[PDB]
Amino acid sequence: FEIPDRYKKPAKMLHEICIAESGASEEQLRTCLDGTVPTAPAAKCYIHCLFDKIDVVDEATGRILLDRLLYIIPDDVKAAVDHLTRECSHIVTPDKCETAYETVKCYFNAHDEVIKFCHLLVLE
Numbered sequence: 001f002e003i004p005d006r007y008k009k010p011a012k013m014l015h016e017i018c019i020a021e022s023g024a025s026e027e028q029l030r031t032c033l034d035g036t037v038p039t040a041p042a043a044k045c046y047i048h049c050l051f052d053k054i055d056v057v058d059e060a061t062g063r064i065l066l067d068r069l070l071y072i073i074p075d076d077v078k079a080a081v082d083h084l085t086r087e088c089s090h091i092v093t094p095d096k097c098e099t100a101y102e103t104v105k106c107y108f109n110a111h112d113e114v115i116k117f118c119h120l121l122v123l124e
């Protein structure tokens with residue numbers, strides 16, 4: 001329901017590093033506030049960067065392994081993670097930015113308590 005305030009600082013840092021790396025503008029990313037995953041190429045590569053920085057990208061295929069966080073996390077995220085990994089961890093495309101885009105698109109439709117991450121990264 002509300003992401004602990006302690007995740008804000010690293011997410012803001014993650015957001016700034018990934019904007020610089022992908023070349024995505026804040027204007028492009030803001031579309032997630034309406035519950036729609038941004039479709040711009042730089043915005044798709046921003047999503048890939050986020051997952052790459054938290055080391056959840058299968059370094060070889062581009063596959064998102066949201067299960068990996070279950071080791072680096074102190075709170076009740078198991079049921080929320082296990083559902084997203086059940087519904088969305090099959091997504092693989094020849095483009096890492098496209099795989100990251102399609103996976104988040106699946107996350108948003110699946111168990112979207114949870115555009116709250118768009119709020120976490122994009123505006124607070």
Ligand SMILES: CC(C)c1ccc(/N=N/c2ccc(O)cc2)cc1
Nearest residue numbers: 029032037038047081084117118121
């Ligand atoms: C498109 C951008 C701005 C974006 C939108 C939502 C995001 N959500 N990241 C999550 C990662 C793991 C979870 O269990 C839940 C959410 C990440 C990036």
